[PDB]
Amino acid sequence: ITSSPVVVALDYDNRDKALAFVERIDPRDCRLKVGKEMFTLLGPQFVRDLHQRGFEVFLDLKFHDIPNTTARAVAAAAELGVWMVNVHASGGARMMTAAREALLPFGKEAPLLIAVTVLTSMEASDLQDLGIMLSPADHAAKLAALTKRCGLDGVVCSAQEAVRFKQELGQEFKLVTPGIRIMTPEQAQQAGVDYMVIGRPVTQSADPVATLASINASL
Amino acid sequence: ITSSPVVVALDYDNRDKALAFVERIDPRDCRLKVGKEMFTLLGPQFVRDLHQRGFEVFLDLKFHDIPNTTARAVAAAAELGVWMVNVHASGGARMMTAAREALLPFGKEAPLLIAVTVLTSMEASDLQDLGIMLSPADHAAKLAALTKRCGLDGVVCSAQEAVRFKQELGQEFKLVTPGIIMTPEQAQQAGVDYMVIGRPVTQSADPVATLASINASL
Numbered sequence: 001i002t003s004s005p006v007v008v009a010l011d012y013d014n015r016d017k018a019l020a021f022v023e024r025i026d027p028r029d030c031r032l033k034v035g036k037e038m039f040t041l042l043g044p045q046f047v048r049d050l051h052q053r054g055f056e057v058f059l060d061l062k063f064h065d066i067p068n069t070t071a072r073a074v075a076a077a078a079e080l081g082v083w084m085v086n087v088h089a090s091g092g093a094r095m096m097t098a099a100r101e102a103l104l105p106f107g108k109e110a111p112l113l114i115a116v117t118v119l120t121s122m123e124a125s126d127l128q129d130l131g132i133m134l135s136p137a138d139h140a141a142k143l144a145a146l147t148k149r150c151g152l153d154g155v156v157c158s159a160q161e162a163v164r165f166k167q168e169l170g171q172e173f174k175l176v177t178p179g180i181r182i183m184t185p186e187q188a189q190q191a192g193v194d195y196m197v198i199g200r201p202v203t204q205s206a207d208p209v210a211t212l213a214s215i216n217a218s219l
Numbered sequence: 220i221t222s223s224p225v226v227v228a229l230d231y232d233n234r235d236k237a238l239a240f241v242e243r244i245d246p247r248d249c250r251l252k253v254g255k256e257m258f259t260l261l262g263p264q265f266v267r268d269l270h271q272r273g274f275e276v277f278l279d280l281k282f283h284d285i286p287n288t289t290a291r292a293v294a295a296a297a298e299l300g301v302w303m304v305n306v307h308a309s310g311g312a313r314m315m316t317a318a319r320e321a322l323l324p325f326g327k328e329a330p331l332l333i334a335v336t337v338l339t340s341m342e343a344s345d346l347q348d349l350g351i352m353l354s355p356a357d358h359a360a361k362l363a364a365l366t367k368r369c370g371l372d373g374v375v376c377s378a379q380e381a382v383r384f385k386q387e388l389g390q391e392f393k394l395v396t397p398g399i400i401m402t403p404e405q406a407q408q409a410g411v412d413y414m415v416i417g418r419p420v421t422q423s424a425d426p427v428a429t430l431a432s433i434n435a436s437l
Binding site: 036042061093127131 | 232254255256258259260261262263264280281282283284285286288289291292295296298299307308309310311312313314338339340341345346348349350351352353358361362365399
């Protein structure tokens with residue numbers, strides 16, 4: 001089990017390429033994030049393929065559904081054995097509560113349950129189309145407070161908001177950075193970030209092993 | 220291809236139970252919906268299995284992500300060959316436009332691209348926690364108009380709102396009910412294009428006979 005806070009994003013469109021990157025690195029050095037594109041293409045067998053190679057996996061599908069269905073989906077991810085799974089806080093308190101409750105029987109096998117608040121791509125003009133007039137940051141803080149109240153394990157949060165969030169929501173509440181947009185990984189850790197998703201800077205480097213080693217050497 | 224507007228929801232937790240039901244019915248009598256639970260359990264191969272049996276499939280995963288990621292996921296669904304796929308309108312206009320653009324190279328073989336507006340399960344009190352002070356129906360209408368403006372094919376909409384939506388958004392804009400009261404016949408009369416039906420069929424005493432009773436009314 002790695003002691004690195006890095007989670008490397010697998011955003012490949014091809015199984016062979018993805019696994020050609022994953023064999024080059026080492027489960028001791030990072031965890032892996034499987035997102036919508038890879039999961040729609042390959043399904044849970046790809047996650048099993050990563051587990052069999054010794055990696056722990058953040059299943060980043062951002063479930064957003066009615067409470068029962070979200071509950072069943074999170075339980076399915078728990079049965080798949082993943083380390084972390086997320087939901088949209090925009091699904092509301094009852095949906096978040098249903099997901100948390102679906103995971104409690106899993107006890108120590110339960111994945112970490114993290115909520116997306118505001119996506120990184122959302123600016124004020126995107127939000128106003130939807131009736132949201134709080135700034136992205138204020139809306140995110142609001143949704144993060146709702147997530148903590150529902151008992152979830154943490155939120156996805158930019159490093160720029162991590163000191164604010166640790167002060168308001170507490171040291172125990174986990175912050176995961178999304179890997180898209182300044183702070184170095186070391187500075188993001190200093191801010192209180194618990195897990196940092198890193199994508200292209202590692203997967204698109206000429207030496208992803210040395211890149212990842214250099215990131216870890218700083219943390 | 221089917222003339223029925225019915226889409227039966229496959230919310231089994233086991234492949235064998237799901238396929239036993241699918242073996243009893245026929246693709247001429249309905250299409251099928253594959254949601255989060257079955258897809259997280261079985262993946263795209265389950266969709267392929269349904270296609271091999273002749274069914275058209277609504278892949279109901281409610282993608283809600285940054286624009287580029289939602290676009291790649293919708294393209295993956297198109298590659299899989301599904302009949303309908305959905306996204307959350309709550310993902311915003313740029314996300315929906317990205318999904319629309321991702322399907323253009325698939326042309327007429329693209330899935331229908333439908334947006335979830337407000338989930339059936341959301342009441343006013345659930346929306347208020349999010350800062351939304353409109354009624355579910357009024358918020359849904361706002362998100363539906365946004366979906367039309369972005370050029371998507373339609374929305375998931377209760378039958379109780381279909382008359383309003385056909386008047387305001389036009390006949391060409393597709394309405395899909397979620398099946399989560401109005402009868403299927405009344406829903407069709409109100410303007411519903413496709414109706415999702417789940418446990419009323421799959422947990423009935425005789426699902427083939429239930430489905431035939433529904434189709435006879437339509």
